[PDB]
Ligand binder design. Structure first.
Ligand SMILES: Nc1ncnc2c1ncn2[C@@H]1O[C@H](COP(=O)(O)OP(=O)(O)OP(=O)(O)O)[C@@H](O)[C@H]1O
Ligand SMILES: Nc1ncnc2c1ncn2[C@@H]1O[C@H](COP(=O)(O)OP(=O)(O)OP(=O)(O)O)[C@@H](O)[C@H]1O
Ligand SMILES: O=C(O)CCC(=O)C(=O)O
Ligand SMILES: O=C(O)CCC(=O)C(=O)O
Ligand SMILES: [Mg+2]
Ligand SMILES: [Mg+2]
Lengths: 115, 111, 109
């Protein structure tokens, strides 16, 4: 099981899960998150390369990907990374990468509610 | 709004990322520009919050994102500015996230 | 010499550069030739009765690297995205907690 190392971020309450994967898997990934009860997410189309350099490389070799950013509590990181990795997986190069980033604060605009 | 940055001692810069209704973008940008905040970066995005949209990809709602990097001391004020201008009073107004930043470099004058 | 000392223990960092779109091919070429192991591109807009505003297209690169590579990569990006006129953009360095490769479940490294 995926175990994310958050030890260099003691006291951080919230993390951002940034998942970049094949565009055709977006509905699967979203269904898996919806079923788990995910409390929100943001989707952006991006382009990129990993270790294999696309397709040296140039802009023409960058490959279309879908990105999701999912801010979750610390306690939910591993579960959510695991769900997104499992849903996005095919077993071939280019299946994606997940970056976990620390978040200092969350503020709901409608209410001014923080934390 | 008070922002808890105690977990990041010694961090000098933060990124304020606001995701909000597209129609409020000109209001948010005007309020920030008038207050003297620069370096705004805008990306259109699609999303859901706690109510699960308008769930599947067709329930994702268009939103506008604005990212601004400020110093630690400026976070609370800039967060408040953004919140006040994005506000409408209805669910779906948006969220603001604050993120630590290690370093800032201006390309035109990089050493 | 990027000051990463408020991030003890953090292994990976994200280099985020926002710059003129016409410089994209050259930035990519430079990083490719130098041997970069990954990047992500996003188009974004800079913000240049309501006051007079203008949205200006820019290109964004996010490049996650190990600590040791941060200064070299920042230097190459700065040099390739430079024109010397006002409006060249900015580079930020952000801490990253974890990196997971989906195909393999491999983390870290
Ligand atoms: N170091 C990195 N920095 C920023 N973005 C990255 C990086 N590595 C990968 N990405 C992004 O994630 C996408 C998917 O990467 P990819 O799945 O090809 O990873 P990889 O490490 O090459 O693994 P694999 O060997 O399975 O292909 C890339 O197209 C790019 O958008
Ligand atoms: N946990 C999250 N992770 C990442 N993005 C999110 C998260 N929650 C909200 N967002 C982004 O912010 C947008 C606005 O969220 P919204 O304002 O609906 O927040 P909410 O917590 O549901 O507040 P409210 O009850 O006022 O609707 C979303 O459409 C999405 O793009
Ligand atoms: O993204 C792909 O579909 C293949 C290319 C790849 O894995 C890479 O550039 O790392
Ligand atoms: O974004 C909206 O307009 C309403 C939907 C919502 O608030 C949500 O999904 O959380
Ligand atoms: Mg790859
Ligand atoms: Mg909502």
């Amino acid at each position: 099981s995926i175990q994310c190392d958050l030890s260099a971020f003691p006291g951080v309450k919230f993390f951002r899960i940034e998942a970049i994967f094949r565009p055709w898997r977006l509905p699967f990934v979203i269904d898996t998150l919806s079923k788990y009860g995910i409390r929100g997410l943001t989707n952006t189309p991006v382009k990129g390369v990993g270790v294999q350099g696309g397709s040296e490389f140039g802009p023409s070799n960058l490959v279309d990907k879908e990105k999701l950013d999912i801010v979750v509590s610390r306690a939910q990181v591993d579960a959510v990374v695991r769900l997104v990795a499992a849903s996005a997986y095919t077993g071939e190069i280019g299946d994606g990468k997940i970056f976990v980033h620390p978040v200092a604060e969350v503020v709901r605009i409608r209410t001014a509610e923080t934390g």
